[PDB]
Structures are given as C-alpha cells and as structure tokens.
Symmetry: C2
C-alpha cells in the first residue's frame, strides 16, 4: 500500500505539538486522568471527575497531542460555562471551597449580566510551557467566534497546583502571571507538599497575562498552530 | 476505518517541520528542482543534475517535509563524499569553476589523508531559516555515527547563491556566518542579479558557524527533531 511505511521513516525523532478540538470519542480517559492530576488525590475524591470530563468535552476545549489525532491528549484547556452549568457537581464543589468563591458567584455573576468561565487547564509535567500562549489564544477564539461580535467571558475561575520545593514553585509557570493580575487569589494548606490554588481573573487580566507570557518559541508556535 | 478522519481534525492549522533521511523512491524529482534553484538557470546547464541527485540519494542526506513522509522535500542537506566520487560529473564541474577550487583539490589529493564533503543545501524560499541548525546537526551525526569514534569530514565545499538588492543579500542566512569562517570564499559576477558563491570551510569553522546561528527557535527544533 504505502511504500513509505516501514522504510526508514522513523530514523529521526519528530516531536510535534499538534492542536485539536476536544474529541468526545477519543479524549475522555486521558482528560479524566489529567483532572486527577490537577485536583490531586484528595480533592479528586470530592468531585465527580467523569461528569466534569463529559462537561469539558461539550465545552470550548483545545488539546495538544504529539502522537496523532487518534492518541491521548497530553495537555488541554477548557472554558466551562458557569451559568449554563450552575447546578453541576463541579459548581457544587467550587461553592464549598471558600466563601470568596461563593460570594463572587452570587454577587458578581448571579447579580446581573456578567459571564464567568470555569477554567480547566492541565498537562503532563514533561510538556513544554511554551505551548500555553497558543493554547489560550485558540481556546479564547473558540469562545469569541461562537459568541460572535468579538464577545468574551468577563471572568475566569482558575484552579491550579503549586508545590513546596523542600520555597514554593509552580507546576504551571503561567500562574505567576495570573496571580499578578488576579482579582482574588487564595490557597489551601499544603498536603504532601502540594498546594491547591484558586484565582479569579477578569478578561483584561487574562489577556495581559498571556501577552506577558509570550516568548520567541510560543510566538513561533502561534504562527504554525492556529485557526483558519 | 479511522473514525478521527473527517471528524473536525482540521479545525486548527498545524504546520510541523519533520526531518527524514533521503528517500530514493520519493525525493528525486523535488531534489533535482531544488538543485536547479541552487545552481541557477545557466550553471544548471553545465551540471548533470540527475546524476547529482542520484549521488545525493546515496549519501548522508536529511530532508524537511511539512506534508508527510510521502510528500516532496521542501529543504535538504547532503554531504557527498569527494574521494568516493572523485571522477563524478559534479567534481569535474567544480574543478573548472575557478582555479581557487582546483588548487584546493590538488592540495587535498596530494595530502592523501584529508577528507572533504561536497555540501549540497537548498530549500524553498518560504522555509524558515531556523531549521538550518538542526538540519546540519542531524546530517553531521549521520556521518559521525557511521564512521564511529566521533570522526568527521575535515573540509566542506559549499556552493550557494546571493542576490543584488537593486547592496548584496543572502538567500541562505547561514552563509553570512559560513563566510566569516571560510578557508576560501569567492563569488562570480552577478547574472540576472544572482551571484554564485563558493566557500570551503574546515570542520571547526563549520561547527562555529552553526553555533553562532543558533536561536531560541532552532534550539527548540533541535530538542524535538533529532536521532534516537
Ligand atoms: Ca515546532
């Protein structure tokens, strides 16, 4: 059939970071395990991660795969809509994390017309951090294009994880910038050296964070990995 | 059948630069046309380019393809062995280019112990120049791995092309660095605004040139496109 198969085509390692929309036929298992990594072994027992993975797969979502469209995602970003999922298990969880979250939802979001995205972002720890700017730009475009009129979310709820080095460092280096612009930031006590961290950002702050995150490599990736 | 085909897999453009060994079953036509571009319309009538492309396909050669292993190379680098091909049409051509190349060949032949690569390097003008450091590193490894003992060629004869701006500029930005380290470098008179340029480098000068050429992006490519 294909005379280039089994004919020296793998002599050179070629690791490519290809971006795909969330695929409900392929991505569920790997997404569920990335959520387990994000929330950690204790909080994973407190969230229905199967339900959250299903929600993600019906939401604006971008994955990164190095082993083809058929393979597992090694990184994803998803913007889950708060108001449309206001009765979801994950919203139920977030309402109980801290009064700052429940107060924000009630007073800033339920109060009026402002829209809130629940950000789910995780990747295997060997994934390069320079994929993050193109990842956010593509997924933000998914929202803006579907909403039309260059609209966007007003606020973003980001859950992430940090660690004690014996000093605290970041699994996701972009969180350094998110923290700089966060309207609200708080963290749980460390457990097994890992800290659960919660940030509320407005859209201006999110965009500023991604701009400040840009490197020569992430700009290169944006030029080669983008919507039509 | 592949259920991920015709299922949203092209929503995001993903341009990747994959590196392959020279493929005699696929690459001949494109290599010959890249040789025509390299030598130009006048000198192409003075070289048997079919014979040269055949020599390239039997030599250490790396190509870059964006459209898969079955597609045409858009960039290649080849090190053709001088001594093994010392009666070839291409050596005959180089001997008559200029007394400065003929004198170098004589000094080499008479030495009896030095090895020289005939470097053939060309790419479509839309290819990004940052691919050049990983392209050279992979092809040099082809030589060193085959020979063992970290051995390498002593000298490299590079034919290239430059152009008159109406000032002289480079089709291959790496030539600016090669020129600074060249054992011998001379150029023919411009024809139709295009200048034929001839460089002889020793291995130390070639290594220094590639190191000077490295950028954040070319180093990124090296980390993701390399031998096993
Ligand atoms: Ca790349």
């Amino acid at each position: 059939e294909n005379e280039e198969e089994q004919n020296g085509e793998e002599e050179i390692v070629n690791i490519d970071f290809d971006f795909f929309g969330g695929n409900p036929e392929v991505d569920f298992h790997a997404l569920k395990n990335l959520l387990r990594q994000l929330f950690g072994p204790q909080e994973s027992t407190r969230i229905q991660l199967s339900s959250l993975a299903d929600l993600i797969l019906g939401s604006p979502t971008t994955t990164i795969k190095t082993d083809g469209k058929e393979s597992d995602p090694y990184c994803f970003l998803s913007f889950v809509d708060f108001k449309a999922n206001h009765l979801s298990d994950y919203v139920k969880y977030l309402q109980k994390v801290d009064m700052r979250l429940s107060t924000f939802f009630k007073t800033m979001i339920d109060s009026g017309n402002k829209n809130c995205a629940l950000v789910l972002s995780e990747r295997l720890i060997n994934m390069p951090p320079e994929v993050v700017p193109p990842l956010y730009k593509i997924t933000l475009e998914d929202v803006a294009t579907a909403l039309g009129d260059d609209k966007h979310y007003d606020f973003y709820i980001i859950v992430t994880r940090k660690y004690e080095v014996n000093e605290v460092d970041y699994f996701h280096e972009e969180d350094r910038f998110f923290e700089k612009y966060a309207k609200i930031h708080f963290e749980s006590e460390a457990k097994k050296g890992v800290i659960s961290s919660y940030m509320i950002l407005d859209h201006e702050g999110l965009v500023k964070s991604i701009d400040e995150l840009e490197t020569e490599i992430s700009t290169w990736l944006e030029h080669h990995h983008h919507h039509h």
